[PDB]
Amino acid sequence: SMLWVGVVSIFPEMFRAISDYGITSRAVKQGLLTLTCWNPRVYTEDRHQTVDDRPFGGGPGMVMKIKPLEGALADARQAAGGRKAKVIYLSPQGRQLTQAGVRELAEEEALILIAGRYEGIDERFIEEHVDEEWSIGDYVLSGGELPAMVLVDAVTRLLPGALSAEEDSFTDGLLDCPHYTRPEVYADKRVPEVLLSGNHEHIRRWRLQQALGRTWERRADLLDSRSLSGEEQKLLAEYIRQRD
Amino acid sequence: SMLWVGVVSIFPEMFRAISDYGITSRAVKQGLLTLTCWNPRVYTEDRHQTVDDRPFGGGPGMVMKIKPLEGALADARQAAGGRKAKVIYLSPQGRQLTQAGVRELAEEEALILIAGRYEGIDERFIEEHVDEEWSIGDYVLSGGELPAMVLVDAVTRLLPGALEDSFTDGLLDCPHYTRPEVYADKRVPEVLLSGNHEHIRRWRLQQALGRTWERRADLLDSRSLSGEEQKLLAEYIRQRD
Ligand SMILES: Nc1ncnc2c1ncn2[C@@H]1O[C@H](C[C@@H](N)CC[C@H](N)C(=O)O)[C@@H](O)[C@H]1O
Ligand SMILES: Nc1ncnc2c1ncn2[C@@H]1O[C@H](C[C@@H](N)CC[C@H](N)C(=O)O)[C@@H](O)[C@H]1O
């Protein structure tokens, strides 16, 4: 396989959402992706120990112990074999996931994703064993399982033969253009005429202007980090004066 | 139920990740959350159950056809009953989901989440039927199913009785420690083992402030840093190598 992924989670069977459905399922079948789970409860000191314990200093919730996690990671590294496995902890305190980040992660041989639960995992585990911390965004979820599946799904799309990933939002810093399909007219709304009767340069130009315009209206910060050209400044100026 | 959620998806089986697990599963059981799926493949009139069609203007991929989506939303809106249902489309082109956004969505009685597939859904469906578009972040996924579950999970945490946070009041969370006191030559900070609530309260606030400053200074700029916090953060900064 092109990419080996090992997931450290207390709910391995949640990962059926990506292993049984979509591109990730197809990539596993096609052999582009190997997906494996490692339950920390199977690695406790003895069968009478929980993965979690009480936080030192008080406060709400439970914290995940270092020993169950350290066991699961050791066993997962062993299964990675000769691959250079990057150990990622899914955390709201990590590097914000972006398409550029997804392209970087898609070049790795192996990835060991650590899906936290409760209030989090012990800092000494992160300090010792985690290579990088990643966030899917600025919000708090109950576990790192949906974030790990978000990472895996975004990365898998970029694997050769998995799917257009070179016609997307955040590829050239722009948002995508609108998409239209049959019928030509639906509920008093017709498909733009350029898509129906325009040539491949008219379509290329209308699609670029719509992408520029949508990015300007919704995600202005995206244009600040992406210096527009003279063609684009003209197409966007036209969009602004014509949006109504 | 406190919150009714209807999901329009071609893979309703994927939603077992939230219906069988955690807080969302617990909230369904506790009756705080009603979760339902509406497969557009059931609102199609052919032998192989088609939801996709070819895009106008050319280019790669398929676009999701209106009729299957029209059907599933109509049926979902009927099931919402007398609830004020907000129709959200999960899109990388929508409003970026943040904790403040999660707090706003948690005040709604009903939500109809539209989980797209392929290259997207027809713009005329979004223009006609969708109230707001939401993104989970600046990256592209193959479908709107993981994003819809991300929304539902973040919102459910804020439902009274479902369960301070890393994006609440500006700051990121402090580090967490548990048993043993010493592991592989690494000991838990002494403040945490001491037992003085004010010492712990101030150390924890300082570590949050410090972690936010180091990693997410942007969060701090858009925050009302008190005299207590300015002092604790100044101390965090000056007392590090
Ligand atoms: N936005 C996110 N992106 C990636 N992982 C997340 C995100 N939100 C929550 N998590 C995961 O969910 C786990 C459990 C969370 N309830 C704890 C969050 C923690 N109390 C904090 O505020 O940082 C975390 O340890 C992460 O693994
Ligand atoms: N970051 C995201 N946040 C919310 N939904 C997403 C996100 N990424 C992809 N999607 C969903 O996945 C569907 C299919 C995507 N492959 C299409 C994305 C589209 N080509 C674009 O660049 O905007 C979209 O219609 C959305 O429903």
Ligand SMILES: [Mn+2]
């Ligand atoms: Mn596209």
Ligand SMILES: [Mn+2]
């Ligand atoms: Mn139109």
Ligand SMILES: [Mn+2]
């Ligand atoms: Mn917290």
Ligand code: NA
């Ligand atoms: Na035609």
Ligand code: NA
């Ligand atoms: Na705190």
